[PDB]
Amino acid sequence: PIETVPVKLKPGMDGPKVKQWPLTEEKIKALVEICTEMEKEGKISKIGPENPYNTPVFAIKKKDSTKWRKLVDFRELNKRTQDFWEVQLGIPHPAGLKKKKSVTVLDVGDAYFSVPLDEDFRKYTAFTIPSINNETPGIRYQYNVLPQGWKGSPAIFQSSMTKILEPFRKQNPDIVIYQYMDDLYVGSDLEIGQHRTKIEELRQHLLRWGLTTPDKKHQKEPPFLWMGYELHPDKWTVQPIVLPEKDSWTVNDIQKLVGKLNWASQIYPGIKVRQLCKLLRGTKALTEVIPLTEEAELELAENREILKEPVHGVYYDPSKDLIAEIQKQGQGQWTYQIYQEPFKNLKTGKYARMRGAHTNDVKQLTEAVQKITTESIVIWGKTPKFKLPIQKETWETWWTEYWQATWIPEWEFVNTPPLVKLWYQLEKEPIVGAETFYVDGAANRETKLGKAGYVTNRGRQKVVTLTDTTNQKTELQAIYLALQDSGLEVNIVTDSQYALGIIQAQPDQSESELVNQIIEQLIKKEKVYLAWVPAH
């Protein structure tokens, strides 16, 4: 006795009119059975000639009873049904959930078939039970409830539940109820009796709305499997992931493997797949067998060891601080872990080596910080205070002079090397004393032949011919050599627009090996003053 939701077709399309797949007397007789039952449960209704629509029904036998079941292919109807608002695609994250005295899962199983269908739309869900090898008219029906597999069902079922629960929720604020699929997750801080009692009350409530609830056999018990996690109301634990030991590894095996590993990389500290990834180089087929190198076999062994460690975790307590600590795990990689109380982590994780075109550490730290911040706001609706491996002075000096706006929330320094710092700093003004290198590189973009060189105020000069180069490259190489052949302090002038970029950005990493080199040289100099001048 629940209010139907108004459902419409697309844009003015038409209900599906796909023909009924031919089945056997056997498959038919089964569907005939199940459908008479459904007919009586009130879920479906026998119709007649007044309906041009149709969806193919199928007959499959599952494992649980090997008993003949049924399936209706709504694909077409779905592609013809109007759009609804996105169903919950953002699921809760264990680190964000709060600890409870108890938690119970109730199974509103075929509740899909409990909610009434918008009487109008019903004709579109019509299907047909075939006759023995296409004899006269097979049996015709239509759904009167939310069909398993139908597009609207999910969002609808969810809403329906939401109204029905509004009352109960309002009555007992101190009771939290999570909806997911056909599962209700109710937890509390009440005494188990009170709790179990309330569970019952809630159940009964459902019962009022025709919502049939569990049989002790199907009853799920804690902990709970929430994708990679085992959750006990007291705390969570990461499911023990297994790496199979074999003597034959296909590319698939290596990819899938690398995958699983990667996932663990977020939780378990120490994971590495470098040598594994290496095995993928030049692969010709998925079913291809690639023998593991010694190094491959090695890291695989080290990993098995780490993975046999029990990673246990803590839930969110709104009365305590949210803290986030980061580590620069090599260049371009960052590790973080959020805990309220030392060593008791809610969530941890690391962000991959973002191979970009050109940046620096501080920027990278920043981007990690933001990624984290965002996650936090979704998880706890609060940003964590930050503990960063960079001096506040480094921060101040970099940010206050960078061309692009950036910011790091309330943070604090924690000396946990390696610390991030500025690899160099181009001079503010030209250096008095130091030599000057008027550099220049020119290449024919079509013959890809070029030359690069310099002339200094001191007399030094040089040129280098290059084959299979580009003008950009030359200009840079000019600068490269300039740094190479210069002492600790260098004044270099150039008309390369890109160098102007380097003056403004002062990146300490780039997609270009060449640039990188220059950076290395830069970092090496005691002082460097870049000056740009218009070309020609």
Ligand X SMILES: CC1=C(C(=O)Nc2ccc(Cl)c(C(=O)OC(C)C)c2)SCCO1
Smallest separation (angstroms) from another protein to the CB of 88 = 6
Non-local (6+) Cβ contacts of 259 within 8 A are: none
DSSP per-residue string spanning 261-274: HHHHHHHSTT---H
Provide the token pair at 104. Answer: 């119970």
Q: Is 97 in the site for ligand X (CB under 6 A)?
A: yes
Sign (positive or negative) of CA dihedral 148, 151, 157, 160:
negative
Provide the token pair at 107. Answer: 């199974």
Helices marked H in 91-234: 153-171, 192-208
Nearest-angstrom CA–CA distance, 27 and 35: 12
- Interface with another protein (CB under 8 A), residue total 66
Q: Is 155 in the site for another protein (CB under 8 A)?
A: yes
Q: Which residues inside 170-189 make contact with ligand X, applying CB under 6 A? A: 176-178, 185-187
Binding residue for another protein, selected from 45, 78, 82, 131, defined by CB under 8 A: 82
Nearest-angstrom CA–CA distance, 532 and 148: 68
Question: What letter would DSSP give residue 20?
Answer: P
Q: How far is CA 353 from CA 260, 288, 332, 509, in A?
A: 18, 28, 4, 12
Smallest separation (angstroms) from another protein to the CB of 90 = 4
Query: If residue 253 lies in a helix (H) or strand (E), which one and from where to where?
Result: helix 251-267
CB-CB contact of 347 with 92 (8 Å): no
Q: Is 224 in the site for ligand X (CB under 6 A)?
A: yes
Binding residue for another protein, selected from 246, 274, 407, 428, defined by CB under 8 A: 407
Q: Binding site residues, as ranges?
A: 107, 182-183, 440, 475, 495
Per CB under 8 A, which region of 136-144, 150-158, 196-204, 302-310 contacts another protein? 150-158
Smallest separation (angstroms) from another protein to the CB of 361 = 16
The closest alpha carbon to 389, from 356, 352, 360, 362, belongs to 362
Binding residue for another protein, selected from 85, 218, 245, 310, defined by CB under 8 A: 85
Per CB under 6 A, which region of 16-24, 225-233, 282-290, 412-420 contacts ligand X? 225-233
Pick one of ligand X, another protein, none as the site partner of residue 297 (Cβ within 5 to 8 A by kind). Answer: none
258 or 531: whose CB is closer to another protein?
531
Non-local (6+) Cβ contacts of 224 within 8 A are: 103, 105, 185, 230, 231
Binding residue for ligand X, selected from 61, 98, 308, 460, defined by CB under 6 A: 98
Which residues make up the interface to another protein (CB under 8 A)? 5-8, 82-86, 88, 90-93, 96-97, 152, 155-156, 158-159, 162, 176, 178-179, 366-367, 370-371, 373-374, 377-382, 399-407, 429-432, 436, 438, 455-457, 491, 493, 500-501, 503-504, 529, 531-534
Which residues make up the interface to ligand X (CB under 6 A)? 97-98, 100, 103, 176-178, 185-187, 222, 224, 226, 231, 233
